[PDB]
Subunit: 181 residues, 3 copies
C-alpha cells in the first residue's frame, strides 16, 4: 500500500534512509520542489490551442524538477548516493528561451503586474513558487552541503517563468499592465 | 464587523483567548490547514460531468479539516477546551478510497509526474499543500503537545490526494506520465 | 538580460543594495507578497460576465501590493529610501467593500466552508495566501523595523478576500456551505 504509516508520528526518511523530522530544512526543500512540480503540472493543464507551443517545455521542467528534488534529498556525505543533476545543459536551455521570449514580446522598462490570461497568470504563480522553493533551498545550503547546480537552475527557472508568462500573454494578444509608480 | 483591528500589530488569539504573534508555530499550523481547506474548495470547483463522483468526498475533507484546525488551535493544558478530532473513522475512510482507487487505475512501478487533467493536477497541488501543512504541524508538535490524531489523518490525507489524482486522470481517460529516470 | 546570475549562490539585494541570503526574513516577507500578487492576478483571470464588477478592485489590489512589497524591501535606517505606503485611504476602501459585501449576501452566524464557484474559491485561496504573507511580515517585524502601515493593510486585506469570496458566490447564485459542527 502507498500508506505505510511510518510517518504517522512526524518523521520520515531521505535518500540513504536516515530519518529526519518532517520539518527538517532538507525535507522542506525537496517538499517545496514537489509543490512547484505539481503547480507546473496544473499550469500545463491550462494550455489551449493558442498556447500549445509551451507544452513540451513545461513537461521537461517537470522531469528536471524530479532530478533536482532527488539531489536535495541526497546527503552529500553518503557516497553510495551520487548527485545526478548537472546544471549546464538545462540552464542554457532556459536562457535560450528567456532570450527568445524577451525578444518577441513588447519591451518594457517598468515592472509589470503579474497577471493577464489564465495561463500567463499561472506562469507568474509558478515564478513565485519557484522563488519560495529557492528560499528553502538556501536555508538548507546554510546548514548542509548541497548540489549547488540545483540552486543555479532553480534561480534561472524563475526568470524563465517570468519570460514565459509574458510570452503566454503575447500568444493570446493580451498586453501586460505596468506598475503605476 | 469582521474586521476588529485587534490584529493590526501582528498578534492574535487562539482557542481559550491567549494571545500569540501571528508567526507563532501554532498559528502557522492551523493557518496552513486553512490554506489547504481553501485549495480543496478550489479543487472541488473544477469538478465536471466526468468527475462528479469525487464531489462529496472533497466536501467531507473540508469539514474534517475544520475539525483538525480546531484541535491545532486548542492548547493541550487548557482543560476547558477539549480536542474534537478522532482519527480512526476518517482515516479508515481515506484508506478505503486509497485502496479502491489504487485498484482501478493502471498499476505503476515508477514515479509519476504530477499533472494530467486540470482536476488531477489540482489534486496533486492539494497533495503537496497537505504535506506543507504537515511540516508545520510537526514544527508545532516539537514545541507543544498536540492532538496526535490530527497528524495521523494529515499524513494519510496526502496519500489520498495522490490516489485521487490518479483516479481523476483515469475518469477522463488521461494516462499518467512516468518520470524518465 | 533579466538573468544576471548574481543570485546563483543564494544571495540577493534589497532596496539600497545591501546583500542578504534569500532565506532572510525580509526577503521571505516581500517574496510572499509577490506570491500573493501573482495569485491575485490568477484570480482576476477567472472573472466572467457574472463577476466583472470585481475586476477593477483586484487590479487595484495588485498595484497596492507592489507598494507594500516596496516598503518591506526598504530598510528603515537607510534614509535615502523612504516608505511610500500609507494605509488610511486603501484600508478604508477595503472596509467600505467589506461592509457593502457583508450587507448584500445572506447573513451567517457559523463558519463557512471556503469554496463554491471557481472565482469564490480562488478568493478564499487569496485570503489564506494573504494570511501566510502576514505571518512572514510579522516574523520580519519581530527582528527589524517595518512600515507598520503595510501590516494594517495586509491584515484588513484577508477580511476583504473573505467578504469578496462570499460576494462572488452571491453573484453566481451559489449558496455558501456551513461548517457542520
Ligand atoms: C525521495 C523520495 C521521493 C521524492 C522523489 C524525488 C525527490 N527526491 O524529490 C518525492 C518527495 C517526490 C516523493 C514523492 C512520493 N513518494 Co516517495 N520516496 C522517496 C524515498 C525517500 C527515496 C527513494 C530513493 O531512495 N530513490 C533512490 C534511487 C537510487 O532509487 P530509484 O528507483 O531511482 O528511486 C525512485 C523511486 O523511489 C521514485 N519514487 C519516489 N517515490 C515514489 C513512490 C511510488 C509509489 C513509486 C512507484 C515510485 C517513487 O523516485 C525515485 C527517483 O527520484 C523513498 C523511501 C524508500 N523507502 O524507498 C520514498 C517512497 C518510495 N515514496 C513513497 C510514496 C508513497 C510517495 C508519494 C505517493 C507520497 C505522497 N502521498 O505524495 C509521493 C508521490 C510519488 C510519485 N510522484 O509518483 C513510498 C512508496 C510506498 C509504496 N510501497 O508504494 C516510499 C517507499 C516511502 C515510504 N512511505 O516508505 N518520494
Ligand atoms: C479558531 C478560530 C478560527 C479558525 C477556525 C477553525 C480552526 N481552528 O482552524 C479559522 C482559522 C479557520 C478561522 C477563520 C476565520 N475567522 Co475565526 N476565529 C477563531 C477563534 C480564534 C476561536 C473560535 C473559538 O474559540 N471557537 C471554540 C468553540 C467552542 O466555539 P464555536 O462556536 O464552535 O467556534 C466556532 C466559530 O468561532 C467558527 N468561526 C471561526 N471563525 C469564524 C468567523 C466568523 C465570521 C463566524 C461567523 C464563525 C467563525 O469556528 C469555530 C469552530 O471551529 C475566534 C476568536 C474569538 N474571539 O472568538 C475567531 C473569530 C471568530 N474569527 C473571526 C474571523 C473574522 C475569521 C475569518 C473571517 C478571518 C479571515 N479573514 O480569514 C476567517 C473565516 C471564517 C469562516 N470560514 O467562516 C473573528 C469574527 C469577528 C466577527 N465579529 O465577525 C473572530 C471573533 C476573531 C477576531 N478577529 O476577533 N477562525
Ligand atoms: C525590490 C525589487 C523587486 C521587487 C519589487 C517590489 C517589491 N519591493 O516587492 C519584486 C520582488 C516584486 C521584484 C520582482 C522582480 N524583479 Co526586481 N528588483 C528589486 C530591486 C532589489 C530593487 C529595485 C529598487 O531599488 N527600486 C527602488 C526605486 C527607487 O526605484 P524604481 O525605479 O521605482 O524601482 C522599481 C523597478 O526596479 C521595478 N522593478 C522591480 N523589479 C524589476 C524588474 C524589471 C525587469 C523591471 C523592468 C522593473 C523592475 O520595481 C521598482 C518599484 O518598486 C532591484 C535590484 C537592482 N539592482 O535594481 C531588482 C531588479 C530590478 N529586479 C530584477 C528582476 C529580474 C526581477 C524579476 C523579473 C525576477 C523574477 N524572475 O521574478 C521580478 C519581476 C519583475 C516584474 N514584475 O516586472 C532585476 C532586473 C535585471 C534586468 N536587467 O532586467 C534586478 C536589477 C535585480 C537583479 N537581478 O540584479 N523585484
Ligand atoms: N510532509 C512532507 N513534506 C515533504 N516531504 C515529505 C513529507 N512527508 C514525507 N516526505 C518525503 O516524501 C517521501 C514519501 O512520503 P510518504 O508520505 O510516503 O512518507 P511518510 O509520511 O514517511 O510515510 P507514510 O505516509 O507511508 O506514513 C518520504 O519518504 C520523505 O522523503
Ligand atoms: N495571518 C494569520 N494566519 C493564520 N491565522 C491567523 C492569522 N491572523 C489571525 N489568525 C487566526 O485566525 C483567527 C481569525 O483571524 P482574524 O483575521 O479575524 O484575526 P485578527 O487578525 O487577530 O483580528 P482582525 O483581523 O479583526 O484585526 C484569529 O482569531 C487567529 O486565531
Ligand atoms: N528566491 C527569492 N525570493 C524572494 N525574493 C527574491 C528571491 N530571489 C531574489 N529576490 C528579490 O527579488 C529581486 C529580483 O530577483 P532576481 O531573481 O532578479 O534576483 P537574483 O536572484 O539576486 O539575481 P539573478 O536571478 O539575476 O541571479 C532581487 O533583487 C531580490 O530583492
Ligand atoms: Cl548498502
Ligand atoms: Cl517600475
Ligand atoms: Cl471560563
Ligand atoms: Cl521512478
Ligand atoms: Cl547614494
Ligand atoms: Cl461555526
Ligand atoms: K505514504
Ligand atoms: K552523496
Ligand atoms: K478579522
Ligand atoms: K485542552
Ligand atoms: K533575475
Ligand atoms: K528608510
Ligand atoms: Mg534570481
Ligand atoms: Mg506520509
Ligand atoms: Mg486579521
Amino acid at each position: 500500500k502507498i500508506y505505510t504509516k511510518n510517518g504517522d508520528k512526524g518523521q520520515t526518511r531521505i535518500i540513504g534512509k536516515q530519518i529526519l523530522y518532517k520539518n527538517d530544512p532538507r525535507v522542506a526543500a525537496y517538499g517545496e520542489v514537489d509543490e512547484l512540480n505539481s503547480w507546473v503540472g496544473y499550469t500545463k493543464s491550462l494550455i489551449n490551442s493558442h498556447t500549445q507551443v509551451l507544452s513540451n517545455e513545461l513537461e521537461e521542467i517537470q522531469q528536471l524538477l524530479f532530478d533536482c528534488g532527488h539531489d536535495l534529498a541526497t546527503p552529500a556525505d553518503d557516497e553510495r548516493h551520487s548527485f545526478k543533476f548537472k546544471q549546464e545543459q538545462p540552464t542554457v536551455w532556459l536562457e535560450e528561451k528567456i532570450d527568445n521570449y524577451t525578444q518577441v514580446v513588447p519591451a518594457v522598462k517598468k515592472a509589470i503586474l503579474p497577471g493577464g490570461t489564465q495561463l500567463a497568470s499561472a506562469l507568474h504563480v509558478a515564478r513565485t513558487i519557484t522563488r519560495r522553493a529557492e528560499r528553502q533551498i538556501v536555508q538548507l545550503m546554510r546548514e548542509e552541503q548541497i548540489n549547488q547546480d540545483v540552486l543555479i537552475f532553480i534561480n534561472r527557472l524563475s526568470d524563465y517563468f517570468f519570460a514565459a508568462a509574458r510570452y503566454a500573454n503575447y500568444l493570446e494578444q493580451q498586453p501586460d499592465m505596468l506598475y503605476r509608480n
